[PDB]
Amino acid sequence: DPSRRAPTWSPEEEAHLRELYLANKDVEGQDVVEAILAHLNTVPRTRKQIIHHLVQMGLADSVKDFQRKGTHIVLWTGDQELELQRLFEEFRDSDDVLGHIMKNITAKRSRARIVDKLLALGLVAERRELYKKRQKKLASS
């Protein structure tokens, strides 16, 4: 796809991905991501894609280290997202849904970790919606 998270790669191309990473990791205090991202105009792929394949090939540490605010992110799988997804909307009409989310859950997560993931799923538009009273109205703040 045109200019999104598109894979067009090969064992050689990702060796070229590490190629650029290994070459531009030597410079200090620089944006290593953009160095890679911008120099291999072989494949149309988003910023996430350089980070993705590098930490996935085990030659990089984490998404955190690359360019963004540290997210320890608890390994979010489809089933695990479903825990949060269902419980959130099932106790959304409560005095504190996240309170229930931790008590009635399988995975012990953090408040900040949960609220970020709600926004990512599009379960809410902000943090206040999940900290409201027992309302029963279309929750779109």
SS3 10: coil
Do 84 and 117 form a contact (C-beta atoms < 8 A)? yes
User: Which range of residues forms the domain containing residue 113?
Assistant: 78-130
Angle of helix 78-90 relative to helix 111-121, nearest 10 degrees? 90
- Domain identity same for 89 and 63: no
Please, what is the Cα angle at 71 between 70 and 75, to 5 degrees?
150
List all residues 6 or more positions away from 54 whose beta carbon is below 8 Å from its beta carbon.
Answer: 17, 18, 21, 36, 60, 66
* SS3 (DSSP) at 118: helix
Q: Are 125 and 140 in contact (CB under 8 A)?
A: yes
18 and 53 housed in the same domain:
yes
Q: How many CA atoms lie within 13 A of 123 on its CB side?
A: 25
Q: Do 61 and 82 lie in a common domain?
A: no
Do 63 and 83 have their domain in common?
Answer: no
Cα 49 to Cα 5: distance, rounded to the nearest angstrom? 6
Structure tokens at 68: 């963004």
φ/ψ (deg, to 5) at 110: -100, 160
Tokens of 54: 């590098």
Q: Tell me: do 86 and 50 sit in the same domain.
A: no
Total structural domains within the chain = 2
Number of H helices, E strands in the chain: 7, 0
Are 19 and 11 in contact by the 8 Å Cβ rule? The answer is: no
